[PDB]
Design a protein around this ligand. Structure first.
Ligand code: A1IBY
Ligand code: A1IBY
Ligand code: ZN
Length: 295
């Protein structure tokens, strides 16, 4: 009746190595980068919204909003200095996605994260839909210029506490983040339209599937497509209040599996089942060593 022979990680692994599973879409959120030292600035425990008094804001969310930013970019860039990572070292989860790419299984990774770790882990622009944008590149805001600047340039400006201005036209330069008040990139909708005709497996890692329209991606899968959640908490189920949600646990469940724990440990377990654990270990050890050894 169903593509998975059982609703377990082992069933998913068996399906993945069957001839029926050729194209995997990953949907990822902040949970895949916390072990890298990047806080989930949507979890209250990080306390982002609490410390934001030194920036003297009209309301807390204005520092994440596009119009305020264009009028007053200094608070955003001071906060960006405060929150700048000490290192950019992707996680076992990120490299698991790189292994998917290497094995010819990765159709697309849709990410909510702006932290660039997918790119550092070796996913290419074509592999990625950065649904909420990214720090990886920045652009002059003037429509007639749009000069692109890499993260190293932006970092130099942020740490020297100089507001980044375009070298060609002296306009403000903004990281390619989707600020509040901007629309998600057109790439998100056009890729969605094409990719979900083609997907054999949805791997949902490190996201509670609460932010829209990203969360709605799980309902774009074909009805037969298995969907594996690797996350500290079960998520994406139909909300009993607000009227294609995940069904892990009912008598009617047939394709959705929940593996509850840290994303790294779930990806290690899945890799072990697939026979990839040594490959993943070697890839992570050498990439981490190269990052640690940046001189
Ligand atoms: O996610 C953030 N900062 C970490 C980071 C990641 C990659 C590159 C630079 N910074 C971040 C979130 C909200 C507001 C600001 Cl201002 C920064
Ligand atoms: O989450 C979003 N953007 C990321 C972000 C990070 C730091 C500062 C501002 N925005 C976002 C924006 C607009 C609509 C939606 Cl649905 C999400
Ligand atoms: Zn410019």
């Amino acid at each position: 009746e169903r593509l998975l022979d059982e609703l377990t990680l082992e069933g998913v692994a068996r399906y993945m190595q069957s001839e029926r599973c050729r194209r995997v879409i990953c949907l990822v959120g902040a949970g895949i980068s916390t072990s890298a030292g990047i806080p989930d600035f949507r979890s209250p425990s990080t306390g982002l919204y609490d410390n934001l008094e030194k920036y003297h804001l009209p309301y807390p969310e204005a520092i994440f909003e596009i119009s305020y930013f264009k009028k007053h970019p200094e608070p955003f860039f001071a906060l960006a200095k405060e929150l700048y990572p000490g290192q950019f070292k992707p996680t076992i989860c990120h490299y698991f996605m790189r292994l998917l790419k290497d094995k010819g299984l990765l159709l697309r990774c849709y990410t909510q994260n702006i932290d660039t770790l997918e790119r550092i882990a070796g996913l290419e622009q074509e592999d990625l839909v950065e649904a909420h944008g990214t720090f990886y590149t920045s652009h002059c805001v003037s429509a007639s210029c749009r000069h692109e600047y890499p993260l190293s340039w932006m970092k130099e400006k942020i740490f020297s506490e100089v507001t980044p201005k375009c070298e060609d036209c002296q306009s403000l330069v903004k990281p390619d983040i989707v600020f509040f008040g901007e629309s998600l990139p057109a790439r998100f909708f056009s890729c969605m339209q094409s990719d979900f005709l083609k997907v054999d497996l949805l791997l949902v890692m490190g996201t509670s599937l609460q932010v829209q329209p990203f969360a709605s991606l799980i309902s774009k899968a074909p009805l037969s497509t298995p969907r594996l959640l690797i996350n500290k908490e079960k998520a994406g189920q139909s909300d009993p209040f607000l009227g294609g949600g995940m069904d892990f646990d009912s008598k009617k469940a047939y394709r959705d599996v929940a593996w509850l724990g840290e994303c790294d440990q779930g990806c290690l377990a899945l890799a072990e089942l697939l026979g990839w654990k040594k490959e993943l270990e070697d890839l992570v050890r050498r990439e981490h060593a190269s990052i640690d050894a940046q001189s």
